[PDB]
Amino acid sequence: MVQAWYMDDAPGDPRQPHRPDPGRPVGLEQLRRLGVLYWKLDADKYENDPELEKIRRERNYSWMDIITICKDKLPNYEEKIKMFYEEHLHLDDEIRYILDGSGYFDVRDKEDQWIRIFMEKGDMVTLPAGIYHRFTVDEKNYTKAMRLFVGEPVWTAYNRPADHFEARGQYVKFLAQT
């Protein structure tokens, strides 16, 4: 089971439950078609069960680590949180696993629709590259999740807009001509 809302027919007001009239919850299967993948494992069962590593092999993930979010335990909160706070696009994939804490991930559909997805402990989520997304969890102001990336940590130093790069940007222009 996955927790998410189809705000496509719901009011932008965050305070509201975003329950359309009639109301309709996100379709887990619908998102999978969108290219969204999620792993259900117990953080405690993750380390005790390298099986999660097996999933990495399928997604070609050689680098993995455990990251926790906290103002006091996460120096550089303003820039770090603001950097991923804004929605951006790029040719890189997004793999996040919530070992602990509560939060939600922002995803976009090809139909130009936005869905609010809630991330729970033990629930992992993957966002295909080339799709806009926004990660937030300020509601709890304390979330612990693992991140899986391939190659050198690009996030360490990256440009907001993916198109910013001629090679990673100019290439995108070719798609427009398609």
51 labelled ligand-binding = no
User: 27: helix, coil or strand?
Assistant: coil
Residue with tokens 């102001």: 141
Residues 6+ apart with CB under 8 A from 22: none
CA distance 159 to 23: 38
Residues 6+ apart with CB under 8 A from 131: 35, 89, 107, 108
Radius of gyration of the chain measured on its C-alpha atoms:
17
133 labelled ligand-binding = yes
To 10 degrees, the CA torsion angle through 124, 130, 131, 132? 110
CA distance 76 to 70: 10
Closest CA to 135 of 114, 94, 106: 106
Which segments are annotated as binding site? Answer: 88, 90, 94, 133
Which segments are annotated as binding site for Fe(2+)? Answer: 88, 90, 94, 133
Which segments are annotated as binding site for Ni(2+)? Answer: 88, 90, 94, 133
